[PDB]
Write a protein that binds this ligand. Structure first.
Ligand SMILES: Nc1ncnc2c1ncn2[C@@H]1O[C@H](COP(=O)(O)OP(=O)(O)O)[C@@H](O)[C@H]1O
Ligand SMILES: Nc1ncnc2c1ncn2[C@@H]1O[C@H](COP(=O)(O)OP(=O)(O)O)[C@@H](O)[C@H]1O
Ligand SMILES: [Mg+2]
Ligand SMILES: [Zn+2]
Ligand SMILES: [Zn+2]
Ligand SMILES: [Zn+2]
Length: 646
């Protein structure tokens, strides 16, 4: 079996740090228990000739170890030493170095506050001293990344909570989100406006060498360009990062698969599932057996595909945005190797119901029967599957909160109450559908959503201080477009409602630099409030939330901004809980499901759980609540359909 890429083990670390060992300070040390796996395999079987390491014939000493059944490096396929293996290369504006001198040049650059691109297991990172305000500002400037939080690598996990240390030190070695109070060494520009920082430990030998020497936290963020697939070759990294890195610490061992760092919360909640988890399979729920080979294409954003067969499923790594130029290359390579590893040939392909998706174009090219699943149905089913809900387990009431997904009859959904089982999805109610003014711009400029909300629900909205910048603009042209339905489609979007509230509070830039920025800012603000007595509500009118009442109460409830933010989360949670309670109780349903990327909001989850203690509650945990989990949901629905003989 092939296991996921694994953090350097204690024994290899000990060996690398022992003067006199053949592998002393050798940056590519590995053994049967650790090192790259998926990222170095060209084809099955797992054997050196079909790995990236085929072009580095073993010296006699390595060969003896590789062939000795009692040795820790027995059949360690990518094993090497300084005499036979890959080596470091340093490149910086006409300067060049190799091996230990390459490492030392990179260290000198980091110490001096410069930015260096570093080759990792699954791509390249950009690094700098995370304490150094100037370096971090320069990185942000050069990368055109004014706000999005930066991952940091710490030399050790000392001082972090037990739960965080546990996760950090696993073979998966994920980025773990922790409260920034635990890491005071980090400059304020690491995660501005947020309450958490993503921290990670060195997990390959080169990272251990660097952190051992540097003894300080380092930014360790992905080395790519917005809109472009990440580099896995030296040549692409050199091209992509030329304006950004001051120098390049690279090497001649090929990476053949894109494999980003995984991201989890200290709580264990999975956000991004890549390095260290892929290509591990997962068991399907009770009742799923003898399932035909189904390829599930997942979603256009934060993509993963799924292979379903028999009684198991295997998810791909994070493959990013499918609309990005040239992203299909890494996607197809991932699919090639996954199919090879599992001897898998699909007989069916499942994809999203949105006819405009890139994935839905790709599906049309496969010469296989195709079928669709509604976006929000797949979110709900993915949560059911992770909780091992049996095939015949019965209906649940589901709350699916996100940005936008296509619902029934071409409606744009994003804040819905649904009656759900693996075969069926009935829409019951939710947020009212409100125009997205300027289409794609509405996710980029929170004020557009505040305008759309005000036009629908707020008498004399121009008179409120919250709406001042919108009021001062010639907003009437946009209001005319909205009335005429010109690039202003209606969407019942929970993400856009967050943005409207963030716009009203002023807690985000007028134009965002990354998706979800306003929502995360609003949550971070609300989280600093420990709870408050407040009059804000979202009453139920028929099967929808009454946002006219909400805005009237919220706009007229003056309080510190953190309390206003908290009141919004609390009112939204109470309103959705009342809708779900009515729908479930009158259907004899005792279990509620929650999914969609908005459910990554910890405060909203906490308030929902507070209001719904009279039900069994299922929240996502080992798979992302957002689009990274979508393909699993598609897979279980397709399987359930097939098992019913549909
Ligand atoms: N402080 C943080 N809060 C939330 N997410 C974070 C944080 N730091 C890193 N991340 C995660 O990292 C991913 C961002 O990708 P990228 O732009 O490559 O940044 P990086 O490589 O620094 O993680 C997101 O999925 C996000 O979940
Ligand atoms: N902390 C948060 N609070 C509220 N909403 C959030 C938060 N984090 C992300 N979101 C929203 O969830 C969306 C991602 O949801 P997801 O289901 O992954 O994608 P999609 O909208 O494409 O279906 C983000 O674009 C943003 O709208
Ligand atoms: Mg500390
Ligand atoms: Zn090892
Ligand atoms: Zn050797
Ligand atoms: Zn979604």
């Amino acid at each position: 079996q092939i296991v996921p890429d694994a953090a350097t083990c204690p024994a290899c670390l000990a060996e690398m740090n022992t003067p006199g060992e053949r592998r002393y300070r050798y940056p590519f040390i590995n053994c049967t228990h650790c090192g790259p796996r998926f990222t170095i395999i060209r084809a099955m079987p797992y054997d050196r000739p079909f790995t990236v390491m085929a072009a580095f014939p073993l010296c006699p000493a390595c060969d003896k170890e590789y062939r000795d059944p009692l040795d820790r490096r027995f059949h360690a396929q990518p094993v090497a030493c300084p005499e036979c293996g890959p080596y470091l290369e340093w490149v910086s504006h006409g300067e060049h170095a190799e091996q230990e001198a390459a490492l030392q040049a990179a260290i000198a650059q980091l110490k001096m506050g410069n930015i260096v691109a570093i080759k990792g297991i699954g791509g390249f990172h950009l690094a700098c001293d995370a304490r150094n305000s100037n370096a971090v500002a320069t990185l942000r400037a050069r990368k055109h990344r004014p706000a999005k939080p930066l991952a940091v690598m710490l030399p050790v996990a000392d001082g972090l909570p037990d739960a965080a240390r546990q996760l950090l030190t696993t073979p998966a070695a994920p980025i773990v989100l922790v409260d920034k109070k635990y890491v005071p060494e980090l400059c304020d520009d690491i995660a501005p406006g947020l309450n958490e920082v993503g921290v990670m430990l060195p997990a390959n030998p080169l990272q251990h060498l660097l952190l051992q020497e540097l003894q300080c936290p380092l930014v360790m963020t992905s080395g790519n360009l917005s809109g472009k697939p990440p580099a896995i070759s030296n040549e692409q990294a050199l091209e992509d990062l030329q304006g950004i890195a001051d120098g390049f610490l690279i090497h001649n061992r090929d990476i053949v698969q894109r494999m980003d760092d995984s991201v989890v919360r200290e709580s264990g909640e999975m956000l991004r599932r890549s390095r260290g988890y892929v290509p591990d399979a997962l068991a399907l729920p009770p009742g799923f057996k003898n399932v035909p080979p189904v390829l599930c294409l997942g979603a256009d954003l934060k993509n993963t595909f799924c292979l379903v067969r028999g009684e198991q499923v295997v998810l791909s790594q994070h493959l990013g945005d499918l609309s990005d130029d040239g992203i299909q290359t890494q996607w197809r390579e991932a699919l090639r190797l996954m199919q090879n590893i599992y001897n898998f040939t699909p007989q069916y392909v499942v994809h999203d119901a949105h006819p405009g998706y890139v994935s839905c174009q790709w599906a049309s090219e496969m010469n296989l029967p195709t079928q669709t699943v509604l976006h929000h149905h797949a979110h709900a089913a993915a949560c059911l599957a992770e909780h091992q809900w049996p095939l015949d387990g019965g209906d649940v009431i589901a709350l699916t909160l996100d940005g936008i997904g296509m619902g029934e009859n071409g409606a744009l959904w994003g804040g819905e109450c649904l009656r759900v089982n693996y075969r069926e999805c009935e829409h019951l109610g939710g947020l009212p559908a409100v125009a997205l003014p300027g289409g794609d711009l509405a996710a980029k400029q929170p004020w557009r959503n505040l305008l759309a909300q005000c036009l629908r629900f707020v008498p004399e909205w121009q008179n409120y201080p919250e709406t001042a910048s919108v009021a001062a603009a010639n907003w009437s042209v946009l209001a005319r477009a909205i009335e005429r339905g010109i690039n202003a489609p209606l969407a019942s979007s929970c993400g856009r409602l967050f943005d409207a509230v963030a716009a009203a509070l002023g807690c985000a830039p007028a134009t965002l630099s990354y998706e979800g920025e306003a929502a995360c800012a609003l949550e971070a603000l609300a989280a600093s409030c420990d709870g408050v007595t407040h009059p804000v509500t979202m009453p139920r009118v028929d099967n929808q939330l009454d946002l006219a009442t909400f805005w009237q109460q919220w706009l007229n409830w003056q309080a510190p901004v953190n309390q206003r933010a908290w009141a919004f989360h609390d009112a939204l949670a109470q309103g959705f809980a009342a809708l779900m309670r009515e729908q479930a109780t009158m259907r004899g349903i005792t279990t509620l499901v929650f999914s969609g990327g908005v459910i990554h909001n910890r405060l909203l989850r906490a308030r929902l759980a507070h209001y719904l203690a009279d039900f069994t509650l299922l929240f996502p945990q080992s798979l992302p609540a957002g689009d990274g989990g979508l393909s699993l949901g598609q897979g279980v629905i397709a399987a359930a359909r097939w098992l019913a003989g549909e």
